[PDB]
């Protein structure tokens, strides 16, 4: 005698954050689904951030190159926040080349078909010297949650060419999740709560797919509650 909630609206006010609206939800479920969906969305989603890099002419993280106006540590710290979306593969390598005066942006990264950058205006590092250039190739892989840089060394796959650099993984596409309930429309009745969820995405995840995947995760893990 319950009413099944169905997705009815996806209000994309901008390219970064959006709103999803649920339609009739029975009384008391406004805080069950909302809190559970918020927790699932904020905890477990498949990110696509950067994992590993290798610069053309540096030996470690703490050295400095000639021509760039900020440290290699600073370029790694700015690069760990890059928002990149991968469609075809799950582990891909992208190349970067730039010379001359002027800051280098994500739009200057080679953009082979499968990989698609979402924020071309993002800055990585500036360039001041005329006859200076950087040729960095970058590593992006799938995953979920959060992986510290210290645990990344546990692979023991002979990951010791001195030109490699490990950056702190941060792939978790959602950033800020909010939800609220309100009185729904009439539907020749009352006491139905509409659930409105505002989601702040870095740019690599559409709202409807995020909600669908979160609901699938919740249902799959709750299917174990069919006891003996």
């Amino acid at each position: 005698e319950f009413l099944k909630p169905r997705l009815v609206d996806i209000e994309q006010v901008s390219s970064t954050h959006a709103k999803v609206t649920l339609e009739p939800l029975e009384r008391g479920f406004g805080h069950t689904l909302g809190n559970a969906l918020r927790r699932i969305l904020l905890s477990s989603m498949p990110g696509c951030a950067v994992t590993e890099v290798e610069i053309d002419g540096v030996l470690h993280e703490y050295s400095t190159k000639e021509g760039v106006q900020e440290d290699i540590l600073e370029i790694l710290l700015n690069l760990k926040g890059l928002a990149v979306r991968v469609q075809g593969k799950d582990e891909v390598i992208l190349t970067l080349n730039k010379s001359g005066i002027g800051p280098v942006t994500a739009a200057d990264i080679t953009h082979d078909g499968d990989v698609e950058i979402v924020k071309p205006q993002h800055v990585i590092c500036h360039l001041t010297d005329e006859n200076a250039s950087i040729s960095m190739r970058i590593k992006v892989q799938r995953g979920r949650g959060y992986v510290p840089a210290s645990t990344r060394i546990h692979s023991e796959e002979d990951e010791r060419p001195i030109g490699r650099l490990l950056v702190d993984a941060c792939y978790s596409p959602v950033e800020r999740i909010a939800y609220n309930v309100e009185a729904a429309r009439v539907e020749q009745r009352t006491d139905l709560d509409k659930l409105v969820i505002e989601m702040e995405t870095n740019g690599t995840i559409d709202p409807e797919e995020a909600i669908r995947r979160a609901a699938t995760i919740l249902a799959e893990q709750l299917e174990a509650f069919v006891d003996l």
Binding site: S43, P148, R176, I177
Partner: protein, 50 residues
């Protein structure tokens, strides 16, 4: 009585973990207790967790 002396510089990146002594600017000391994941945090009605 020395032939050669060699000095090397190790450079560690110390992260935060339960046990690090933190403080404000006047009085309120504290040892960090738990790295609680973000979902459990008390969140404001706008959505930003503390």
């Amino acid at each position: 009585g020395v032939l050669k002396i060699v000095k090397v510089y190790l450079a560690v990146k110390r992260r935060i973990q339960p046990g690090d002594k933190m403080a404000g600017r006047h009085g309120n000391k504290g040892v960090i207790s738990k790295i609680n994941p973000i979902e459990d945090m008390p969140y404001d009605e706008n959505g930003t967790p503390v």
